[PDB]
Amino acid sequence: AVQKVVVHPLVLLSVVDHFNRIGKVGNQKRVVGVLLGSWQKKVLDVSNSFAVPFDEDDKDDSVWFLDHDYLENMYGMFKKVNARERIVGWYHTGPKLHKNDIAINELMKRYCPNSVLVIIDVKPKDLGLPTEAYISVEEVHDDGTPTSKTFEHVTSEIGAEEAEEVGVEHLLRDIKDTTVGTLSQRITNQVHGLKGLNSKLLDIRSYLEKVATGKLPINHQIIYQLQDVFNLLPDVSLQEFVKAFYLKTNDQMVVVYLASLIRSVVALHNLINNKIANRDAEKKEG
Amino acid sequence: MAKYYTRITMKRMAQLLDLSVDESEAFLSNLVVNKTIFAKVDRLAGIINFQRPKDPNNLLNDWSQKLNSLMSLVNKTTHLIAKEEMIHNLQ
Amino acid sequence: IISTHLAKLYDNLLEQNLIRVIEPFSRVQIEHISSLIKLSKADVERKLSQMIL
Amino acid sequence: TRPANHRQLTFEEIAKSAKITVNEVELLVMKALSVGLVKGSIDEVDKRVHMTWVQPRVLDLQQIKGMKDRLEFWCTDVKSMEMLVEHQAHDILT
Amino acid sequence: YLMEGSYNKVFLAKGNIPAESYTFFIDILLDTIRDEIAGCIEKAYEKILFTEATRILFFNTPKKMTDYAKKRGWVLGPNNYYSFASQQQKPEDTTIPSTELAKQVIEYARQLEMIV
């Protein structure tokens, strides 16, 4: 239904400052706010946000509040001050997918049809992309309940823009990994993404904690993929997968062998370009 | 038979057509000069085969396909487990 | 002039059917390709030998 | 039941495991490929079949132990081959 | 003559000892040739009957052949030396390159980008 989402770094930042402004409560508060944006060409866009007053008490945690007058007038100001801008859905600060977010989405779907949510990070530590988004799908289906509804993650990335790329690249001024040569790939995804595969091997190790001791629902629809992964584990090293591998090493290295051969001759022509400027000035200048 | 078989004998195919083995060869002749079914028949061992090129490059190419299908699947389960622990032990 | 140009056209159409019937397969007998052209075997074999040369 | 090493059974084994003759198992497996319950290929002269994909089934609390231990030594293999990269290309980027 | 394969011209020189006895030296030269043919019976041979390789060293028919036939293989059978020319287990190694070359490829990039 939706291809992907596009998040600007402003709305990425426009939650953190509110997380600072309610950080004096100390005890517990999740930041929940209205997400504004304009989805076009089946691509979800996210532009602007604010945060709505929201509290939560732990005993009987089914009692939420959205001050809709604050939602009515401030969006009416925002529809005034940017008529290109509209509602796109909502968000919450999302540490660990709290329970009220099954009907918050159903509370305010009378504005946005595909009222998408966004889970963000306030304490960043990962090896992935710390912005997560779901979508609302419902089912009268296989086994669980007559009324069943579960969120599904549509893929997420941080979109840039020519206005804000001026800003963020001025705001970094920090340790950087520019000059992409032979080394940026080695550290953006060869040092890093191999350890990125750690926390996904270890993630399914964490579901594996129920062998005879963990939580009481057992499998039914979790193991059809896990049965496939050991089935779609790749081909063993006996076939011409051995032979055609040596074939292309015997082709890819020849281009490197030519290209390195050129590198020696070019700097040797540079060597004479310094022996023309060494000997032809010691008699001239002194 | 081109789709689901790899290497069938000449006698076996003529038996599922209930006609002569030479009449079978005239059928596979005017279809691959029509090149609408590819086949590489034999008239000494009776060993024909279907969709069998030399395959220099498609081995590692289809192998690289199986990595990306695998890596797209290991990302599917990971963000599906972490919600499943949040519907039993949330608060 | 046709009585001059038919013999040169016959050679071109000889090898044009000769790649046609030889196309669909692998190793094969020489006794069938003479049987599928209605032509002899010694002259065909020399004419086959000219192709790979 | 067979591992991912071969999973290449013969027609005579089906003639044992299903007590049906040789001239009907090809008619059987063409049905199995058509329905979509199995995905593989069929040889006829070497009398073997290269099954590749099978339909996923369910399993009890014992086959997860197979997926427990076969997954567990795949952890250290991701550890071991990466440990070269943070050691050999360490000065290339700090 | 011991350097090349020639063995019979070596023992033609054991018919030609001109100067003194040379006894203890050629008898050690027997022993270092005994294991050498027992070394060179182990090449890729076919069946040899109990006459041909029985006489390639010197011997007519003592039990010394069983002292070699039970030392190495080529099993004592019905006038036969059985050939264990398998040489099948070692090939098809992608892994031994894939450990070593992944070292070498980063070693290429060390003296390629980082100034030394």
Side-chain angles (χ1 to χ4, degrees):
Chain A
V2 175
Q3 182 180 2
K4 64 181 180 293
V5 302
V6 171
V7 183
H8 292 85
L10 270 79
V11 60
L12 180 146
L13 183 146
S14 178
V15 186
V16 183
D17 50 357
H18 185 271
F19 184 75
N20 196 5
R21 290 193 298 272
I22 58 97
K24 63 183 179 181
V25 72
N27 292 317
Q28 181 63 42
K29 184 173 180 291
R30 63 182 69 89
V31 173
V32 176
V34 179
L35 200 76
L36 280 76
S38 176
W39 67 91
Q40 291 176 358
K41 298 295 291 181
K42 300 284 102 176
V43 176
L44 200 288
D45 194 6
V46 182
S47 299
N48 195 1
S49 289
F50 58 93
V52 64
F54 180 77
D55 290 327
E56 189 269 333
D57 294 332
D58 57 352
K59 292 183 183 293
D60 197 1
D61 53 354
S62 298
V63 179
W64 57 85
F65 288 100
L66 299 182
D67 192 76
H68 295 90
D69 195 4
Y70 184 80
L71 187 146
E72 288 298 329
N73 291 318
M74 192 174 181
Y75 175 71
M77 293 181 181
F78 288 166
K79 183 65 178 176
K80 174 168 69 177
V81 79
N82 192 356
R84 180 66 64 194
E85 194 73 26
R86 66 183 185 272
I87 41 92
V88 75
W90 59 280
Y91 66 94
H92 64 96
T93 190
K96 297 279 102 172
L97 199 151
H98 295 282
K99 190 263 290 180
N100 284 317
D101 297 329
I102 191 67
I104 299 296
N105 195 351
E106 295 296 324
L107 183 62
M108 60 180 289
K109 199 185 283 186
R110 75 266 186 102
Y111 297 97
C112 181
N114 47 2
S115 301
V116 62
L117 67 96
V118 167
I119 288 174
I120 56 99
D121 194 357
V122 291
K123 294 184 287 184
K125 69 284 189 188
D126 57 344
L127 282 79
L129 283 82
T131 58
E132 199 275 336
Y134 288 108
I135 203 64
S136 295
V137 290
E138 67 276 15
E139 69 274 15
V140 190
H141 277 88
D142 295 333
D143 191 76
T145 50
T147 307
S148 180
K149 186 182 290 182
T150 308
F151 292 101
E152 294 296 325
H153 176 76
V154 183
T155 183
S156 176
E157 64 184 2
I158 303 300
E161 187 180 2
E162 183 67 28
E164 64 191 4
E165 283 177 350
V166 186
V168 291
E169 294 185 356
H170 179 73
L171 286 175
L172 289 173
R173 295 298 292 154
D174 203 359
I175 184 67
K176 290 187 284 185
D177 199 73
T178 61
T179 67
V180 176
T182 188
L183 61 89
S184 178
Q185 293 84 13
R186 297 287 179 267
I187 280 90
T188 195
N189 219 156
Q190 301 294 99
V191 164
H192 185 268
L194 271 299
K195 301 278 96 162
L197 194 146
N198 188 21
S199 299
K200 273 71 190 174
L201 200 162
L202 195 276
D203 187 75
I204 71 169
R205 180 69 180 271
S206 66
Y207 183 80
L208 185 147
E209 296 294 327
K210 59 100 188 173
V211 170
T213 58
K215 63 184 181 293
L216 194 273
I218 298 297
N219 288 121
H220 295 171
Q221 200 277 127
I222 196 64
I223 46 93
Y224 293 160
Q225 296 178 358
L226 272 300
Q227 183 175 359
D228 197 9
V229 170
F230 287 170
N231 193 5
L232 205 141
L233 188 144
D235 186 70
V236 293
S237 178
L238 55 85
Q239 196 61 254
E240 293 89 6
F241 180 75
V242 183
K243 302 283 101 173
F245 183 75
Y246 290 166
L247 182 77
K248 301 284 103 172
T249 302
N250 207 4
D251 287 329
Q252 188 175 3
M253 195 63 72
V254 186
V255 182
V256 179
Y257 179 69
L258 181 60
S260 178
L261 180 63
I262 301 300
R263 186 178 294 275
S264 61
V265 185
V266 170
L268 184 62
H269 185 272
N270 291 320
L271 192 276
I272 307 302
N273 292 319
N274 203 359
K275 301 288 104 176
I276 198 68
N278 195 1
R279 196 262 300 164
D280 287 325
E282 295 294 325
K283 192 263 179 182
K284 300 284 101 174
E285 180 178 359
Chain B
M1 287 176 182
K3 292 178 178 66
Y4 290 168
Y5 290 162
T6 299
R7 185 177 296 114
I8 195 170
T9 59
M10 180 178 171
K11 189 180 264 78
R12 180 74 268 174
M13 181 171 289
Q15 189 171 5
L16 273 84
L17 299 178
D18 294 327
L19 50 91
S20 178
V21 294
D22 197 3
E23 187 67 28
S24 297
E25 293 294 324
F27 289 157
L28 278 79
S29 297
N30 59 5
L31 291 174
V32 74
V33 303
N34 206 169
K35 65 179 71 66
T36 180
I37 293 96
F38 180 74
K40 297 295 289 180
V41 304
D42 189 358
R43 196 174 284 176
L44 183 58
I47 294 300
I48 79 171
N49 53 358
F50 294 107
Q51 295 302 110
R52 297 294 95 200
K54 301 291 184 181
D55 287 326
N57 208 167
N58 292 322
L59 269 298
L60 273 297
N61 197 3
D62 295 330
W63 180 69
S64 62
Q65 183 59 255
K66 291 173 69 175
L67 269 73
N68 296 319
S69 65
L70 180 64
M71 291 184 67
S72 179
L73 186 61
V74 301
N75 208 167
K76 182 66 67 178
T77 309
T78 297
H79 71 276
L80 199 149
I81 287 169
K83 62 99 177 180
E84 188 174 0
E85 293 291 329
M86 296 299 168
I87 60 169
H88 303 93
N89 298 115
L90 194 148
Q91 79 273 18
Chain C
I1 65 99
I2 303 296
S3 178
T4 308
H5 295 296
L6 287 175
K8 196 263 185 297
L9 191 147
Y10 182 78
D11 194 6
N12 207 169
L13 192 57
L14 191 146
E15 283 295 329
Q16 194 61 45
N17 197 10
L18 194 274
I19 53 93
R20 178 66 171 270
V21 187
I22 285 293
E23 189 269 332
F25 44 76
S26 65
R27 64 97 54 80
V28 78
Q29 282 76 243
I30 57 170
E31 287 83 0
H32 296 93
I33 186 63
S34 66
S35 299
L36 264 296
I37 299 169
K38 189 177 71 177
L39 190 58
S40 176
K41 293 190 286 185
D43 53 353
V44 164
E45 185 179 2
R46 295 183 291 109
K47 187 66 177 177
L48 258 300
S49 69
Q50 293 177 356
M51 295 299 287
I52 56 173
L53 287 174
Chain D
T1 304
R2 288 181 188 271
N5 194 2
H6 298 87
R7 63 181 71 188
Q8 183 181 359
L9 67 158
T10 187
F11 292 116
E12 193 271 331
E13 193 272 336
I14 304 170
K16 187 182 265 78
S17 298
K19 66 182 290 184
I20 193 65
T21 185
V22 179
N23 290 318
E24 292 294 326
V25 291
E26 292 88 4
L27 280 75
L28 194 150
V29 298
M30 289 186 290
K31 181 70 176 178
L33 294 176
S34 67
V35 176
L37 57 93
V38 70
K39 288 175 71 174
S41 68
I42 300 166
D43 191 80
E44 193 268 330
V45 66
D46 292 335
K47 272 79 69 178
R48 295 177 68 89
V49 288
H50 294 87
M51 296 301 170
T52 62
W53 179 72
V54 76
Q55 182 66 38
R57 65 180 66 249
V58 303
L59 50 89
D60 56 352
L61 297 175
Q62 296 296 320
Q63 284 75 244
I64 53 169
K65 187 68 183 295
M67 293 188 289
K68 180 172 180 178
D69 291 330
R70 292 183 186 272
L71 197 278
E72 196 272 331
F73 65 95
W74 187 51
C75 181
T76 183
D77 295 332
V78 180
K79 298 284 104 179
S80 175
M81 198 67 207
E82 198 275 342
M83 188 64 205
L84 279 77
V85 186
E86 282 181 353
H87 188 273
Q88 190 54 253
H90 187 272
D91 294 333
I92 282 89
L93 196 276
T94 297
Chain E
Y1 291 156
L2 270 75
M3 191 66 205
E4 70 257 7
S6 179
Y7 289 159
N8 299 109
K9 183 67 176 177
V10 172
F11 296 119
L12 286 175
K14 198 167 286 189
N16 193 4
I17 297 99
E20 61 266 18
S21 182
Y22 287 166
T23 296
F24 292 101
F25 298 166
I26 67 168
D27 289 331
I28 295 170
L29 188 145
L30 287 174
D31 195 7
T32 189
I33 283 174
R34 291 295 186 273
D35 54 351
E36 183 177 0
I37 276 84
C40 84
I41 197 64
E42 299 296 321
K43 280 91 175 63
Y45 296 176
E46 70 274 17
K47 169 172 74 174
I48 298 101
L49 76 157
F50 297 159
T51 303
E52 179 72 29
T54 297
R55 66 108 179 90
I56 58 173
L57 282 164
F58 291 101
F59 57 96
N60 47 4
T61 35
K63 296 294 187 291
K64 189 173 73 68
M65 60 179 288
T66 311
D67 200 5
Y68 294 112
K70 301 298 183 291
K71 187 258 291 179
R72 293 294 95 195
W74 296 87
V75 181
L76 182 70
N79 204 4
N80 191 349
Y81 289 157
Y82 290 94
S83 177
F84 62 111
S86 179
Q87 60 183 357
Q88 194 273 128
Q89 192 267 333
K90 80 279 189 189
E92 291 93 9
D93 46 352
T94 308
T95 303
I96 292 95
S98 184
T99 300
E100 293 175 354
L101 271 299
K103 183 65 70 177
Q104 292 181 357
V105 171
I106 305 168
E107 288 292 330
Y108 291 167
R110 294 177 69 251
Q111 56 176 356
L112 179 64
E113 182 69 31
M114 288 300 161
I115 185 65
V116 295

